């Protein structure tokens, strides 16, 4: 009768959480309760830490070759259960099937890359990864393989509001024949983050979520002696030059901005229509309207709903504030009415114009199906505008001039630059993960 | 009238700064004023930063080959003027001629290794990953860098800090120790004569304000420091909080474990030397040892070997150990020895009574052997920074490992033993990165980076080598798809 | 029965061969026809080349990660189908089950090694060499490649050869042996099952005419071959003529040296296992040995150990050496043994008159040991390619080293001794790259082929200098 | 009275040659004899080979660090005496002082690169990867970059542990002789390097002698193929970067002024006497309209002796080359080639007796015409016309051989398409010379060539 309760993988076995609190998780396409995620109590977290500590020596003594073979078996199991992970992601987040396939494929690629550490290879001890509360980012497949192959135990803190997607990964891991107790999964809220940061045994912490929470976790770990490699997915700015393919550029902008409800980290929400590119706004709005707003499981689901109704309320408030500041809303998704899924948190494609740095929308990470366009007079102005924002991870430029692309790539301080590509390196791990999880 | 004053290095040219406050540099062997250094004001520091910024683009657009050739020319000049720098160091810092020679030689070796950096600076590319899709990976410099060197190593620390930044395309602002800037000025003159373009290297002097400026200024992207723990932690908390990576090899305290299964002779000599070498004025020194088993009974031989070392001026023979750089350091070492004696540590050999002939006015202190030490003594808690050996006799090697782990400043620890199983067990349970076997102090070679560990070492990336390049170079990836329709 | 034919593999379909000329595959244990291999005609080879060329662009533009995934799935299928490949090899080539198992095992190991060429395939770049000027190099596939394998190792050699060309982004046209094509067809079927794009791999069967076509066609970029010296030299010369880059292991001759200061029993066992291993049909066979000092007086123990070898069919147990590849091979081996005997070389052991109960019809030849061999004798100059061991008598290490050097196409040998100075002397004086010490076969892995060198071979560099000033 | 003779180099001593055959070194600026190069006799070459063999073992036994320091001292000496090399080049080959200095700097950079190499030369399954040297090596130099040829071969051939027997350009031996003197002064063991002068007979001898394990050559395709065949016949290592024509594509969107300037500088630079010389160009689309301005820019070049200031291009090495280029231009005109600029009958005031040849430009050339087949190696730029990028790509690919190809354009799509579809080893974008010297078949390839590999494997735990 009652919705199913998730059982945390602690001590090498899935055990029912005895906590009193149970955060109700609702399907974002219809706001129907699908499961409850429990807040890990002090006793459960202590038991998970003890399990990780007891599993650390065995997994460490395990030769690097054995760990690599175990990770290969896990990758094979993922390949077999790929559709299961896709369905889980589509159900929890309402994300389009194709986007779930892409996410699981990227996770598989990251796992296989982690497997290539055969010759590059001591472990630190117990490690933990903190996931964002926005969407079921595939951070487990991104970080857990590195800590594993390096010889460390991992305590993954996934997005409590989407536990099944991660629980299935731990199930497949246990099926991979790995030592029982190496991986532990705990859920909850800021309390669990505080616990993880305070505990001394944990040596490393990972976070890719919001800038505020990322800086908080970084400072807390530094004070409590933890190496944190937080890579928060801050805003992304795209400079659109006139000498570029209009149709392809517009399609890429629409997809990267509203794809998966624009909830992904590298969502290109911000754009810059420099050099008479302003004329492309009508076609952009037309392409946005052409997106089939529908549940991620049904066909024609170019963009899905928001993770939670609170997210929809936040997006509506942000759009209202932007409109109050004099920003013309050329496209309004607040009044979207999806047939058959009205109860869902669906928010149609939203486009904001004449936004400037003074606008709140520019100073706030929307993390939704909203796009903001800016205008400049020269390439140098766009470069300066992009540099002025300290919260930036990746940027893209669309142009057919080699000198323009060179100048943009060089003079721009962003670490990741894209030429004719909306989202370069969509992963934000990597080579530095070895040095991170080792010493 | 005016003792020789060291000048700044602004815009690739030496000039006298506005000296509103002097710092008296005294000869350690005689405590006589041999030089003065001015307090650089905001104006000179701003001018130096502006010169670094203006020189950054030209030096960055310069090919790495020409940079390596400039580094080779600088290394050649060093090799030519090696004895000059050796004498300057022996005069100003107080170490022996041989110590300064070895220092400059290690610096020259590091510079040579840095000269061969072509392959390391080469990026990566993955073309045709997808139809009309390409992936690039370019390494680029961070920008302006800074380096704060201690007084213990007037040459090694700069010859490790500034040449890497130079060859990597970055501009470097060196801040040498106000107590021993002469060697730094000589190295700067040599680098200039090498052929490096003006404006790349700049040098400012100061006591505490220069560090504050270097940390607060935003244009500086990287900072390097070596010295005491307090100053290192201060610089780190300032830099990292201001948005700039920092690497600090703070003051270390190496624990030399002795095993009964050793020859005892070469190891006793090496312990006596490292504990008292260069008056222990080193960022990493073997001023601490742990005796297990027969090592405890071996104390008389250790005391005898310590007595053998004679104290004399660095420029004269028989100078197995030199004087303290400053009289305040001598007073501090004396107070630490007195506290150790009071706290129950039996000092088998008191070095405070030794006096050098003809140089009594200098800060000379003989070899001090402090046995029966335990974690309750202050000599264990506080680093001595002097020719003192802190010996904690332990009945079992487990207690020795526990003590070495408790030490918050265990940058590098070594164990003397001919048995492989003992060294393996020691390295297993000891929480120190640089673990040496049958070696007084395991020092990193020019081929790999520093492998630091406890409070005595912190940073995002190591000083020099592969991780050095990683530190002084970024990694920007481009995903270009030059397709049509 | 109709003796089922060996159908070709062009494009994504195993098209049947319309050739009129056919060769009957005979089982070496009973000389019974078991299959018919076609002689591909001009039209079939042209169609195969067209398929390879059409598949080249898509396979090249595809991410290297996809090719690595395909190779991983192929290696997995091989792991699954190990027994089938082993049985097919034991049936066609006539080797023992253990021999085919080890063959497929080495093939799988090399496939795994090649699967990790991802980092090697990455290029290099130098940013801002001059103002607004950059430099970067792109590693690209050569185009269409071809392979010619010998009658030995019908699975190991292809698994070492074609996967490198595949991962490098090239298309491969594999020409299997005229005698043992079944294993290659099974490997191709397994690869196709791995999800590889159709048309990337093509297989054609035929006699020397096929080699002539492969060497003459211009679209072919690289060719690889392993086998006898004559065929290797011919293929290399023809490729150099038509401009094809050819890498061939022609120095199949191998010499063994045994000093009196060595482990007698172990050295003798290793020599008996290597020389007569798999009927001594492998190219890199230690069919020649130089006995120095007490090795002459040990030679009786070598003969005693060789007598212990049980000549029996591979399918049956206790099979140390199987039948020869063809009856003509047995005739040639017998003729060479008779010539050596006539030349004065004493036949301390004879196997020509061996008769395996129930398999006399086969080409079984027992262990043969020839002594008193001299450089002027034919048994030393001619490659035997069989279970025959030629033994030359020398007095000092210098004599054995000179005998080894006299054979320029002898890039393989080993020395048995206990003194390090003697081993260093042997390694230095001997002009051989692969020099073993107390090992029968010096790393069977041959080279001029694979590894990073294989990537370099199957790839090219394009230095790109671009200065987007304005 | 009698011009000086060119000395040999055997056993660490510049011994005199006893041959009777002597070639007069004519100054290309005035055709005045300034030297006499002899042809090495059989006995002299045998003595040189014997000295190389006797020096091989000692030079090889030394550690990589000793050879590295020797090469560093040699590089320092070169840097000190760069002006002497530049003057010798400008005197013998007639090359401009600026171009000679640039060539010497490029050679010094190559030497340094050879020095920057790491210990790579060295390289129960105990295994080793000792990469021993080959033996006695040799090299043949062309008339394009004679002073730099030895700077390519000596550093690597020596640091790898092999002795070298150089065959410098008989018409430009002074530069190589000065380089060898500097090398000897650097402190290298006597007999490590040897030098002999001669002609095709000498090349035959070198390729035939067995002690020669490896040989390197650059220049015309004919001599390249001949040496390759004759070396492969004797079973010895051979490597040669065959000279070939470079095709400089020019799109209409490219920078007209800059493109024309760079083309006129590269094609006519040093009278086109460079293996990387951009002797051919392809004007795509509206680029055809740039022929008049191209001819104007060519005319703007200042012809003068290499030793005089403002010399943009020098004369030809020998008058035979002048007659050859004149005959080639005549044949092209006869076949219907529409010439726009003719500098054959150029009379440089003060140096009329020299081999000076003014800039020459030719259009309407077709692949079947001799202008497109025969290599000019002179101040001649044949211009082709095309309608689309595909036509230019196909024309460039049809070339039987090519070392470098450049495409001037600002569109990244076109540049990438050209670089990917082209079949040339070196591709340049907005640069007529992709690489100062031919790197395509050294660095890594040179290390792999001048050395071998021995995979000593051993399982010696039982004894």
Curated annotation (Swiss-Prot), chain A:
Classification via SUPFAM superfamilies: ALDH-like
Domain of life: Eukaryota
Binding positions for NAD(+) per the UniProt entry: 131, 133, 157, 160-161, 210, 365
Modification type Phosphoserine: residues: 210, 328
UniProtKB keywords: Acetylation, Disease variant, Mitochondrion, NAD, Oxidoreductase, Phosphoprotein, Transit peptide
Illness the protein is tied to: Methylmalonate semialdehyde dehydrogenase deficiency: A metabolic disorder characterized by elevated beta-alanine, 3-hydroxypropionic acid, and both isomers of 3-amino and 3-hydroxyisobutyric acids in urine organic acids.
Active site (record annotation): 265 (nucleophile)
Protein name: Methylmalonate-semialdehyde/malonate-semialdehyde dehydrogenase [acylating], mitochondrial
NAD listed as a keyword: yes
Single GO BP term: brown fat cell differentiation
Family annotation (NCBIfam families): MMSDH (TIGR01722)
Catalysed reactions listed for this entry: 3-oxopropanoate + NAD(+) + CoA + H2O = hydrogencarbonate + acetyl-CoA + NADH + H(+); 2-methyl-3-oxopropanoate + NAD(+) + CoA + H2O = propanoyl-CoA + hydrogencarbonate + NADH + H(+); (R)-2-methyl-3-oxopropanoate + NAD(+) + CoA + H2O = propanoyl-CoA + hydrogencarbonate + NADH + H(+); (S)-2-methyl-3-oxopropanoate + NAD(+) + CoA + H2O = propanoyl-CoA + hydrogencarbonate + NADH + H(+)
Described purpose of this protein according to its UniProt entry: Malonate and methylmalonate semialdehyde dehydrogenase involved in the catabolism of valine, thymine, and compounds catabolized by way of beta-alanine, including uracil and cytidine.
EC number: 1.2.1.27
Self-association state and partner proteins as the record states: Homotetramer.
Similarity comment: family membership: Belongs to the aldehyde dehydrogenase family.
Modified residues (N6-succinyllysine): 13, 18, 21, 42, 83, 95, 312, 324, 339
GO molecular function: malonate-semialdehyde dehydrogenase (acetylating) activity; methylmalonate-semialdehyde dehydrogenase (acylating, NAD) activity; RNA binding
PROSITE patterns cross-referenced by the UniProt entry: ALDEHYDE_DEHYDR_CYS
Modification sites for N6-acetyllysine: 13, 18, 21, 42, 53, 83, 95, 246, 278-279, 312, 324, 431
Subcellular location: Mitochondrion
Effect of residue 394 to R: In MMSDHD; uncertain significance
GO cellular component annotations of the record: mitochondrial matrix; mitochondrion; nucleoplasm
Annotated source species: Homo sapiens (Human)
From Swiss-Prot, chain D:
GO molecular function, one term: RNA binding
Matches recorded under PROSITE patterns: ALDEHYDE_DEHYDR_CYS
Subcellular localization: Mitochondrion
Enzyme active site: 275
Broadest EC class assigned to this enzyme: oxidoreductase
Pfam families: Aldedh (PF00171)
Catalytic activity: 3-oxopropanoate + NAD(+) + CoA + H2O = hydrogencarbonate + acetyl-CoA + NADH + H(+); 2-methyl-3-oxopropanoate + NAD(+) + CoA + H2O = propanoyl-CoA + hydrogencarbonate + NADH + H(+); (R)-2-methyl-3-oxopropanoate + NAD(+) + CoA + H2O = propanoyl-CoA + hydrogencarbonate + NADH + H(+); (S)-2-methyl-3-oxopropanoate + NAD(+) + CoA + H2O = propanoyl-CoA + hydrogencarbonate + NADH + H(+)
Recorded GO CC terms: mitochondrial matrix; mitochondrion; nucleoplasm
SUPFAM superfamilies xrefs: ALDH-like (SSF53720)
Modified residues (Phosphoserine): 220, 338
UniProt keyword annotations, A-Z: Acetylation, Disease variant, Mitochondrion, NAD, Oxidoreductase, Phosphoprotein, Transit peptide
Parts forming coiled coils: none
GO biological process: branched-chain amino acid catabolic process; brown fat cell differentiation; thymine catabolic process; thymine metabolic process; valine catabolic process; valine metabolic process
Top-level taxon of origin: Eukaryota
Disease entry from the Swiss-Prot or TrEMBL record: Methylmalonate semialdehyde dehydrogenase deficiency: A metabolic disorder characterized by elevated beta-alanine, 3-hydroxypropionic acid, and both isomers of 3-amino and 3-hydroxyisobutyric acids in urine organic acids.
Family to which the UniProt record says this protein belongs: Belongs to the aldehyde dehydrogenase family.
Function: Malonate and methylmalonate semialdehyde dehydrogenase involved in the catabolism of valine, thymine, and compounds catabolized by way of beta-alanine, including uracil and cytidine.
Subunit description: Homotetramer.
Entry protein name: Methylmalonate-semialdehyde/malonate-semialdehyde dehydrogenase [acylating], mitochondrial
Source species of the chain: Homo sapiens
């Amino acid at each position: 009768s009652s919705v199913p309760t998730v059982k945390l993988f602690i001590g090498g076995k899935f055990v029912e959480s005895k906590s009193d609190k149970w955060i109700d998780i609702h399907n974002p396409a219809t706001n129907e309760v699908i499961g409850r995620v429990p807040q890990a109590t002090k006793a459960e977290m202590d038991a998970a830490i003890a399990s990780c500590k007891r599993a650390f020596p065995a997994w460490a003594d395990t030769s690097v070759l054995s760990r690599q073979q175990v990770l290969l078996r896990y990758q094979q199991l993922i390949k077999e259960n790929l559709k299961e992970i896709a369905k889980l992601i589509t159900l929890e987040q309402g994300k389009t099937l194709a986007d779930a396939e892409g996410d699981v494929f990227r996770g598989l690629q990251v796992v296989e890359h982690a497997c290539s550490v055969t010759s590059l290879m001591l472990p630190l001890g117990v490690c933990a990864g903190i996931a964002p509360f926005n969407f079921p980012a595939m951070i487990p497949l991104w970080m857990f393989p590195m800590a594993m192959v390096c010889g460390n135990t991992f305590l993954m803190k996934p997005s409590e509001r989407v536990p099944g997607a991660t629980m299935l990964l731990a199930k497949l891991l246990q099926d991979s024949g790995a030592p029982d107790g190496t991986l532990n999964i705990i859920h909850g809220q800021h309390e669990a983050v505080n616990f993880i940061c305070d505990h001394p045994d944990i040596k490393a912490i990972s976070f890719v979520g919001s800038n505020k929470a990322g800086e908080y976790i970084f400072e807390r770990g530094s004070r409590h002696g933890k190496r944190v490699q937080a890579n928060m997915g801050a805003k992304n700015h795209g400079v659109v030059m006139p000498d570029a393919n209009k149709e392809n550029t517009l399609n890429q902008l629409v997809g990267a901005a509203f794809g998966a409800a624009g909830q992904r980290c590298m969502a290109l929400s911000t754009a810059v229509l420099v050099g008479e590119a302003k004329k492309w706004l009508p076609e952009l709005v037309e392409h946005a309207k052409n997106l089939r707003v529908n549940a991620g499981d049904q066909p024609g689901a170019d963009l899905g709903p928001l993770i939670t109704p609170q997210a929809k309320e936040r997006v509506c408030n942000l759009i209202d504030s932007g409109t109050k500041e004099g920003a013309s809303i050329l496209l309004d998704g607040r009044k979207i009415k999806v047939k058959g899924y009205e109860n869902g948190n669906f928010v149609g494609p939203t486009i904001i114009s004449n936004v400037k740095p003074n606008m709140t929308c520019y100073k706030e990470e929307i993390f939704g199906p909203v796009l903001v366009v800016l205008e400049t007079e020269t390439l140098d102005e766009a470069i300066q505008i992009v540099n002025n924002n300290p919260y930036g991870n990746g940027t893209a430029i669309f142009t057919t001039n080699g000198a323009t692309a060179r100048k943009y790539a060089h003079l721009v301080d962003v670490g990741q630059v894209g030429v004719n590509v909306p989202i370069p390196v969509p992963l934000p791990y990597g080579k530095q993960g070895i040095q991170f999880y080792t010493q």
